[PDB]
């Protein structure tokens, strides 16, 4: 189906403790493959997936040279912004960036994006056409003005619509066995008593991929959206995800409820009852 490649960078300052901590990691959809940690004893861009263990020292030297570069830029931004918002020398701060491209259905390029954040909040984002920017706040406008003049919006559209997608499609093949394959969800129900009069019905969905999923509780058909507990979709840690939905029901009325499970790796939507 449709695919994405995505890079996530986070840099954080440590006052008195010298050099700031830096981390970075890349994804091809919901699977991590590369990882750098400035604290990491390796001082190199380590591999994370099996299908990347496949690249000669030519790669492990570029992607490692390149991340130390990024790390060095962020090393400066951390100080600029400390001034742009006139903060004390003390105190920790964070800048984060994320970029990638969305290869559309037909495996050609559909969307690009590059977003910047200071201290958790939006700072600057490359808008749609990859030739203009959007500033979240007044301070950010200086960075824009700097950037449209030093030609970042234009030199970025070349990495995105060009070599980014290209290498993505390249990663797809080298790892089709996974990134192109699927795992539909293994679904089940559990009963848990709250009192002699009430129980919780928990609807489970496990070991699946991609993360996108929907769990719905009905009562004779009428959606129980409102009195439903949902947990954040979590990682199993083998490249699969779990999730559950839960309703408190009157004891005896269990047969009245059904849990619906919409997912991509499911030809038909599902429906589960506690007692069929």
């Amino acid at each position: 189906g449709s695919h994405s490649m995505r890079y996530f960078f986070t840099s954080v300052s440590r006052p008195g403790r010298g050099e700031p901590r830096f981390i970075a990691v890349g994804y091809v959809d919901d699977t991590q493959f590369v990882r750098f940690d400035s604290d990491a004893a390796s001082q190199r861009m380590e591999p994370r997936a099996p299908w990347i263990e496949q690249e000669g020292p030519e790669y492990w030297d570029g992607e490692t040279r390149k991340v130390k570069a990024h790390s060095q830029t962020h090393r400066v931004d951390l100080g600029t912004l400390r001034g742009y918002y006139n903060q004390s020398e003390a105190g920790s701060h964070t800048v984060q960036r994320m970029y990638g491209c969305d290869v559309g259905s037909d495996w050609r390029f559909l969307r690009g994006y590059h977003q910047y954040a200071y201290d958790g909040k939006d700072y600057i984002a490359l808008k749609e056409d990859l030739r203009s920017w959007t500033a979240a706040d007044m301070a950010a406008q200086t960075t824009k003005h700097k950037w449209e003049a030093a030609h970042v919006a234009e030199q970025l559209r070349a990495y995105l619509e060009g070599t980014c997608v290209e290498w993505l499609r390249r990663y797809l093949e080298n790892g089709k066995e996974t990134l192109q394959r699927t795992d539909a969800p293994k679904t089940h129900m559990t009963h848990h008593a709250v009192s002699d009069h009430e129980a919780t019905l928990r609807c489970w969905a496990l070991s699946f991929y991609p993360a996108e999923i929907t769990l719905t509780w009905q009562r004779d058909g009428e959606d129980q959206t409102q009195d439903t507990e949902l947990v954040e979709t979590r990682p199993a840690g083998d490249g699969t995800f779990q999730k559950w939905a839960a309703v408190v029901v009157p004891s005896g009325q269990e047969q009245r409820y059904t849990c619906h499970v919409q997912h991509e790796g499911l030809p038909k939507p599902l429906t589960l009852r506690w007692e069929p």
Binding site: Y7, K66, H70, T73, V76, D77, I124, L156, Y159
Partner: peptide, 12 residues
């Protein structure tokens, strides 16, 4: 593979 982000033009 990664990208630009090398400096000094990439500075904020």
């Amino acid at each position: 593979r990664q990208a630009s982000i090398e400096l000094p033009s990439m500075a904020v």
